[PDB]
Ligand binder design. Sequence first.
Ligand SMILES: [Ca+2]
Ligand SMILES: [Ca+2]
Ligand SMILES: [Ca+2]
Ligand SMILES: [Ca+2]
Ligand SMILES: [Ca+2]
Lengths: 548, 548, 100, 50, 100, 50, 49
Amino acid sequence: GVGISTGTFNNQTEFKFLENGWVEITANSSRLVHLNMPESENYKRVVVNNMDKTAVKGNMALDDIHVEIVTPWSLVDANAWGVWFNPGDWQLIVNTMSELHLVSFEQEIFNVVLKTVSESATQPPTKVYNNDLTASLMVALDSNNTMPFTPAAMRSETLGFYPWKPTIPTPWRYYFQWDRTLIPSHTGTSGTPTNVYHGTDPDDVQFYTIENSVPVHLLRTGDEFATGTFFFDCKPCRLTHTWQTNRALGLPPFLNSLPQSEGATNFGDIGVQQDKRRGVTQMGNTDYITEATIMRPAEVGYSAPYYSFEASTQGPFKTPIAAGRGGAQTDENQAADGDPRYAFGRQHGQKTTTTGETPERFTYIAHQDTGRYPEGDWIQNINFNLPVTNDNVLLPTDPIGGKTGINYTNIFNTYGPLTALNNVPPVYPNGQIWDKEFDTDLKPRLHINAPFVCQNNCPGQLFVKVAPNLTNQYDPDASANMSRIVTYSDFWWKGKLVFKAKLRASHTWNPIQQMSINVDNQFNYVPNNIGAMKIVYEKSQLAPRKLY
Amino acid sequence: GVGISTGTFNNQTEFKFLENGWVEITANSSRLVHLNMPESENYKRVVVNNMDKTAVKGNMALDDIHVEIVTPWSLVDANAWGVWFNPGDWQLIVNTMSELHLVSFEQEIFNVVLKTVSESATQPPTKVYNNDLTASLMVALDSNNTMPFTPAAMRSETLGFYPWKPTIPTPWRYYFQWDRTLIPSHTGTSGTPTNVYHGTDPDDVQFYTIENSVPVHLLRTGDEFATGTFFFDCKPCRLTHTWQTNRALGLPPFLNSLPQSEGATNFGDIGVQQDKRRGVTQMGNTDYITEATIMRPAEVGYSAPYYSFEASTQGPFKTPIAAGRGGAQTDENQAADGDPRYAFGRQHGQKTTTTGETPERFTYIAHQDTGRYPEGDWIQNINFNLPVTNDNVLLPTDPIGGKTGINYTNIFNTYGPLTALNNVPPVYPNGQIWDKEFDTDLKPRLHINAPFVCQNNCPGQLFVKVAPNLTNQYDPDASANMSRIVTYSDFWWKGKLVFKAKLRASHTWNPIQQMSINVDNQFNYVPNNIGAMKIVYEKSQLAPRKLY
Amino acid sequence: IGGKTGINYTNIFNTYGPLTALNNVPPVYPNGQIWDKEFDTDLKPRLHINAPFVCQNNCPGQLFVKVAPNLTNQYDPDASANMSRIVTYSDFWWKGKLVF
Amino acid sequence: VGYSAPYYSFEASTQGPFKTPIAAGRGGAQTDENQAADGDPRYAFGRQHG
Amino acid sequence: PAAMRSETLGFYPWKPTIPTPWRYYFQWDRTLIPSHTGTSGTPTNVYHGTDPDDVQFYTIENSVPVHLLRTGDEFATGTFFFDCKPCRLTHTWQTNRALG
Amino acid sequence: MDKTAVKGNMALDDIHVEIVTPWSLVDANAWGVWFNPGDWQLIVNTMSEL
Amino acid sequence: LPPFLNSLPQSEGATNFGDIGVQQDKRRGVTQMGNTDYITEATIMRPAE
Ligand SMILES: [Ca+2]
Ligand SMILES: [Ca+2]
Ligand SMILES: [Ca+2]
Ligand SMILES: [Ca+2]
Ligand SMILES: [Ca+2]
């Protein structure tokens, strides 16, 4: 079966308009994947330890020590928006749809090829490449998710984003249990804190092998491998944002006095003394009904401690947060808090011809308003008694623990039974699409890395590896290290991801926000005179939705 | 039937998604119409003559003399985009659809009311208003289009554009035949040109009466009038523009030399001597194949004489043109040529609280590129022979007729059997929707005022009038002028216009142009502190389409 | 005209009108094109100057060909370089059938 | 039968000048070749096409 | 269409041929004011760039399904049936002067 | 522009922009690809329309 | 997915560690600290907590 193709290249997105404003989006994606034989045909338990860094007082957050099992397999990950949609498809979906549903997923591997490299080491000297017609490509599909879930989008290692650029898979590796202790300190700390890696707890040791837990297929040139169709189990993802705050929920106060002339300084007037008003409040001990005092249904968003690192049995880790935000976009300098930052390279959006090893990055700033402005928070004594007196207020300016740069807001947490919150928004093109749910008895209410989380069923990971091409001399009983003919493989990948979307409706008199090409961004969507390209990030929930 | 309503108020737009990316758009529009009794219950033949103006040499274009028949009826016109869609509906249609089809139209008149005004002329003195329960509102629907077609959008006189603002109909009047002669002149002209109104040609006289040619209904409070549904006869209207010029049609030249470094001055190079190239040309006498010389299929757009006034039996009139345009938008100062200019008032888009009698206006600048840049035109002798010599070129700089401000381009016309052209684009909210076809044997290939032209069938005009409320003293045999109780009427109007649209597809890698609200235009879509409003114009064909 | 010694009114002249009778373009052997695609404008040309046949609605689709990338053992998607690939070329036979 | 159009007329739009197209050319007693010009197509080709 | 630049398949059944590199036009604004030999100063000759509202970047991968053919493979287009008027192979010689 | 910079050379304008793709086109839309001189003579001499 | 080690040990040994081999502020991945370029094992983004 050498001279016969086993598949088709398809990278088209189809919209199929059903009934009742629901369309079916079929995203096809094909790619040529390049794969070299493993640097080692063995599994390894490698420890990483950068104590030299953290040894410097004040650097706890630069902790990198961990342990991982390095396997001789590669992972073919296509779980990122950029792998399926191009800028033009995203604009259509994001501008005209109101919500998204993830439906199916299926892959395929065809037109496999295995070449060999011979050192034509003559003068120059040289190199020769030849087909190894009887060689094999090993393929394993972990349908039962026996293996550790390792989504590549987290480290910018998924398949590439351009239909016409060959891509590659990533070396697979997973974490191995270890104990580590790191006591925090600051520049003025004395003596040496405590920074040790304790080793492994035998009761938490799990060494996984693909050979032992997954059936492997050997594909020769004439072979093809096709995953069946996987049908997802999820909630819909919204493509519209909310802008309401507790301050904009409900019936506003009745203005007994309205302006009578156009004018920036012509305001309306409630026209009633603040302690002589009517309405409901939750401050049982005052007569002041204010817009900051009046009672609202519940609470949109919450407060959490910031740049808080917690520690458990294997080192410090940052305390997660859902969303960030602020008022008049002090943007960028605005950033920080809980706005995701993505760093990527030449294959996932960075300008293709860019030299150097510095990645490209961006901080995604969502349209939703469900965050907090710490500088505006404050706490005061129940007696109320305005104007508040210094000993009766704790402002986000007063120090804590004596530290000049720490407030109570840094320690603060206002999550409770009244917290209303939104799931995470899609991030094009670098964001991950779906995630696997934690196998704990009590699960997170949402995942900070993907808008879709398969509870029960999640697609299995696909592993690939070039089978060993040994030379006439091979001795299993020797330390050496098997020597094998330099072999590599190229195969085509093809996936199909199906969504179900709901067409949007116009509910207000005014137009709304839409994604569009303009004089300014115009050149982020076309190649240059050298064929250089780049894929700029874009927002998903542009279009307000009322919350209450 | 006095205390019982005869209709419902509905001003909602519905999109009903059928099969195969085709949606059905139902636009409902309701309004409260106010109507006074006619200033005269008689038809009048009035002549307008402003010779004082045109008597001033050089003012021919300010000619206003005409003759019209002034009728005692009013017209209820709803043929303008603003009567059916609000900014939010337009953005949805314009951003997500690719073409429009006009399907039905139907109207209705309900909840009629007729009041009377009594001069409570006591001290202040005063006024009293009372219901005249037995009074009638006369309604006539000209289904067979017997009457002259007089679309109100041409003079900004259609129903209003805000669902919550009472509107009014316009006094109906039509043109009457007359002969007029006006000889052109300029500031330095001597003697007096010739500016006379000759009167009427008896063989062209047509005096129309609604009473004699249309059946009239008399509606009392308890009555309602409902037009059946009219189904249009038309072609589809496109919501995408073309950008290609003759210069961008076909296979571009093969570049034998491509850039090798990113850089504004790094150009490609055909790399072949101009008179040593291959391809086809229509200049049978040269060997130069240039991008301006190479042969193209036909010709996109044409040239016509500009600010050309022609004259026939009733005075001068401007020579019409389809579209205008230019390169790097020298915009506005760009304008002129054939870009429509709309002047309107408080009821159709002008800021509602604006004082004074000066209207609001705009020049619609289309996205399509099918116009000409006269400054770049030139004509040269067949011998060719470059560089062209002065006596062998006529530049749009060389004078004509000796006039320092006139070129050949002003006289120029290049319309022919190879002219490719586009129909006119929709103009929101002031543009007219449909038009009636000329009853000539050879019709225009398009109308410059509306994207839809019903050839065979066009909806009939609806006329309204308050029936005469006479006093105890009425004498038909006397010159006087009938005296009648001051009566007026208020009734609700309700229309339903149905379209059929085709959802758009994304055909390119790059995103495209979309209408959107931004920091700059944000306040054109919301009322102010006094309730002032305005309706800003918007473009319809934003989204390129390839022509060839 | 315009004072120019080498320009007439005929150079500016246009007599196209409602009475113009005209013929379509003639076939040119062997260099002439056979058919052409119609312009997607609302008002089309009465004829095309480059081909005697113009498919209004339906026109054959274009056929594109390309030699798929034959990479060497060294390929790095994340690098500026420019992929290096084994020098490959192709020869295939084409066969068409046009019926009149 | 036939019509008159401006000759060696170049018009301009948003992307540069282009020659005004014409349907057919011609003349009486074939002053042929020197006759040419007007609207008679000229074809330039190579070794593979003639 | 390649015939416009003399780039179609060859004309001899017994001579190997080749296809032409595909390329298409992209939108751009350019201004060139005409002049003649005696013109003074410098006319105006500038390339303004691209209008974002007319930008269309086409990729075959994204809009057309691609087939991969190995030696043992073949590709066959179905039959396309044209939509056109007939083409005449006879000329007219009459002028207004020879009508009637 | 070096060319058109020379007053009187407007018609030698070549400036344009094009997207260069990595694909090739197989075009057979020309009379010579289908008929040889002998076939053309037969069609042209004995037929009246095509 | 743990970080990709650009440098692996070559001898058995308690002090023979692997090495990410990339400057901390020149790495790729996702973080929730919108205002820094440091992608660390204590900084990198995890699904939840
Ligand atoms: Ca233990
Ligand atoms: Ca906001
Ligand atoms: Ca007469
Ligand atoms: Ca343009
Ligand atoms: Ca523009």
